[PDB]
């Protein structure tokens, strides 16, 4: 299948997944430094003021979009009882690294600077799954540098490093949905050159992680990315940041997207909701 055909398939498959009712939805355009960035704003059914979660979909920097991730964002919104803003960052191979990063940070900054539009008085968090988790993590690093004070970061089986060595990569690199071959191909679509492997904006493990927001990092047992996700948690802890690092057993990469039929996914969404309600509201 072509890239376009797979992008379309993501949207089609999403229409089989129930979309929970939320309080209100609005589609907005965020004025980026390089592009006008579409985003979808979900309000919860409770009354404000709110926290705001800026969410970055996964898809290997190539696939996914606001629509295919609409069911998941609705579910997160109801779980966190918080405004969720799902960001349509530019994709590769049309838009190489660091386009996705530039859009993700620009959106965060604009949300942070415009939070009153959303009655977002309880502050701003970032979160994302897989490649989206990568973008959340990188956006939190970039925020530190600009004195943007985030509340939290929710990293759902994030990609944090180029990896040829972890035991989970070899144990789990075939037979469990996301394969070695996929990982290679996504990296080829996204990166410009081998030198980008030295860039913390691609591998955030490289960065100094002092003074970042407290994190919930979810990994999955049968996931080639498992060990590097746990490494990121450990390096955050070593750098004095509070992190809850949880491995969900018996499930594969992507399981949170399959919450309607993988119950552990629903429970991960419950846990995500709890930590954000705690950090935003005190509970």
Min dist. Cβ of residue 76 to a second copy (A) = 13
Cβ of residue 190: shortest distance to a second copy, in angstroms?
Answer: 28
Task: Provide the token pair at 265.
Answer: 């996914």
Task: Name the residue nearer to a second copy (CB basis): 17 or 189.
Answer: 17
Residue 231 is inside which H or E element, if any? helix 226-238
Distance (Å, whole) CA 158 – CA 15: 25
Q: How far apart are the first and last CA of the chain?
A: 46
Q: Which is nearer to a second copy, 203 or 245 (CB)?
A: 245
Comparing CB distances to a second copy, the nearer of 32 and 265 is: 265
Tell me which residues touch a second copy (CB under 8 A): 78, 214, 216, 230, 233-234, 237, 242-250, 263-264, 266-267, 270-271, 273-275, 277-278, 283
**At closest approach, how far in Å is the CB of 247 from a second copy?**
4
HSE of 205, CA atoms in CB hemisphere, 13 A: 18
Name the residue nearer to a second copy (CB basis): 146 or 267.
267
Find residue 265's DSSP bridge partners: none
Contacts of 13 (CB under 8 A, 6+ apart): 68
- Distance, in Å, from the CA atom of 80 to the CA atom of 255, rounded to the nearest integer, reads 19
Min CB(81)–a second copy separation in Å: 11
Catalytic residue among 222, 223, 245, 257: 223
Nearest to 275 by CA among 233, 244, 249: 244
Q: Give the residue carrying structure tokens 């996504």.
A: 186
Of 130, 143, 161, 245, the active-site residue reads 130
* Nearest Cα residue to 23 out of 74, 99, 89: 74
* Active-site annotation holds for 199: no
Check the CA dihedral 77-232-111-150 and report its sign. Answer: positive
Residue number, 182 or 277, with CB nearest to a second copy: 277
Q: Is 227 a catalytic residue?
A: no
Q: Determine whether 182 is an active site residue.
A: no
- Residues serving a catalytic function are 130, 223, 253
């Amino acid at each position: 299948a072509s890239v376009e055909e797979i992008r379309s398939l993501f949207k089609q498959f999403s229409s089989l997944t129930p979309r929970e009712e939320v309080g209100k939805i609005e589609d907005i355009t965020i004025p980026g430094s390089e592009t006008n960035i579409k985003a979808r704003v979900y309000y919860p059914k409770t009354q404000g003021p709110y926290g705001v979660l800026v969410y970055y979909h996964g898809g290997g920097f190539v696939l996914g979009d606001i629509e295919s991730y609409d069911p998941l964002c609705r579910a997160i919104t109801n779980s966190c009882q918080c405004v969720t803003i799902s960001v349509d960052y530019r994709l590769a191979p049309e838009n190489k690294f660091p386009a996705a990063v530039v859009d993700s940070f620009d959106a965060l900054k604009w949300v942070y600077n415009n939070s009153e539009k959303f009655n977002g008085k309880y502050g701003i968090a970032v979160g994302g799954d897989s490649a989206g988790g990568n973008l959340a993590a990188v956006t939190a690093i970039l925020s530190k540098k600009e004195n943007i004070k985030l509340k939290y970061q929710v990293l759902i089986y994030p990609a944090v490093s180029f990896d040829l060595i972890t035991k989970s990569l070899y144990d789990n690199g075939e037979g469990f949905f996301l394969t070695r071959e996929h990982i290679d191909w996504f990296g080829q679509q996204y990166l410009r050159s081998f030198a980008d492997l030295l860039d913390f904006r691609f591998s955030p493990i490289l960065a100094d992680l002092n003074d970042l927001p407290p994190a919930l990092i979810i990994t999955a047992e049968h996931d080639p990315l498992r060990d590097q996700g746990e490494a990121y948690a450990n390096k955050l802890l070593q750098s004095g940041v509070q992190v809850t690092s949880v491995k969900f057993n018996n499930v594969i990469h992507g399981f949170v997207s399959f919450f309607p039929f993988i119950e552990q996914g629903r429970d991960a969404i419950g846990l995500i909701g709890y930590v954000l309600r705690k950090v935003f509201y005190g509970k």
